[PDB]
């Protein structure tokens, strides 16, 4: 039990150390009780996005060109690269972190029941004469 915002010194249960702010990393723990923590700024191409006592900054991610991604924000010292998709595309998340940019459906011979969203394709419905098969309107006849 150290207070909020502080951590127990790895080599001494007696000492509580103040955490580093996002944008920085732990260069060195407090040398002793009451002493300052030595936090230094993340070098280019790395970052930390939360308060921490981590010995090095995290490597920035890179937009996936193979997924059709585009960069919204480059890596800063306290924020990872942010990636997304273009006009009239949505993100399909294959996993927590991996996503692929696809084109929004136009719901031809149908109607846009729910518009394309950031992370979700257009939901189509069909009207009389057609029916829906894999989000496209096919002729009943």
């Amino acid at each position: 039990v150290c207070p909020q915002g502080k951590y127990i010194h790895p080599q001494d249960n007696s000492i509580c150390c103040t955490k580093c702010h996002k944008g920085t990393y732990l260069y060195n723990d407090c040398p002793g009780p009451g002493q300052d923590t030595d936090c230094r700024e993340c070098e280019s191409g790395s970052f930390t996005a939360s308060e921490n006592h981590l010995r090095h900054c995290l490597s920035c991610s890179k937009c996936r060109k193979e997924m059709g991604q585009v960069e919204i924000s480059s890596c800063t010292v306290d924020r990872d690269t942010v990636c997304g998709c273009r006009k009239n595309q949505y993100r399909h998340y294959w996993s927590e972190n991996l996503f692929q940019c696809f084109n929004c459906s136009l719901c031809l011979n149908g109607t846009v029941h729910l518009s394309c969203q950031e992370k979700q394709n257009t939901v189509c419905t069909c009207h009389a004469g057609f029916f829906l098969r894999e989000n496209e309107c096919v002729s009943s006849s």
Binding site: Y7, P10, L26, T48, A49, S50, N52, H53, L54, R55, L58, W94, S95, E96, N97, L98, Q100
Partner: protein, 148 residues
């Protein structure tokens, strides 16, 4: 003998989830390693060899699909989930043509490295799509952490 150690394996009985087990032949959980909420928890600061294998399988390729496998660290020193080891597989480049045979495919992935970890750090080994995991036989899906 004294070194913290884990070599855990997948529950064959639960489908559509990757649940790790230790109480089986040729599996290990000893000397301080803990398995809590499906995560391996390090008992002591030190260097650990961390590794995992998964085998994915499917019956033909009705759809394009991406499979991921990731070993993550949730560190006391940095309270976010962070990739230690990661990979991706793309088993189904072209869809199986309508009417053609749905031939089985298999995709193993191995991940492994040495990491400085801290007492209390949580390691998890995960896939995006457990429905595709192959639990037919032993030794196909596992997750290990050993203190060097």
């Amino acid at each position: 003998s004294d070194k913290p150690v884990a070599h855990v394996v997948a529950n064959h009985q639960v489908e559509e989830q990757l649940e790790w087990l230790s109480q089986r032949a040729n599996a290990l959980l000893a000397n301080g390693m803990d398995l809590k909420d499906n995560q391996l928890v390090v008992p002591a600061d030190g260097l650990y060899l961390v590794y995992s294998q998964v085998l994915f399988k499917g019956q033909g390729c009705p759809d394009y699909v991406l499979l991921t496998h990731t070993v993550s660290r949730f560190a006391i020193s940095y309270q976010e989930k962070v990739n230690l080891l990661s990979a991706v597989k793309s088993p189904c480049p072209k869809d199986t043509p309508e009417g053609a045979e749905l031939k089985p495919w298999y995709e193993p992935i191995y991940l492994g490295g040495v990491f400085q970890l801290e007492k209390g750090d949580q390691l998890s080994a995960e896939v995006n799509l457990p429905k595709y995991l192959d639990f037919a036989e032993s030794g196909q899906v596992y997750f290990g952490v050993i203190a060097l």
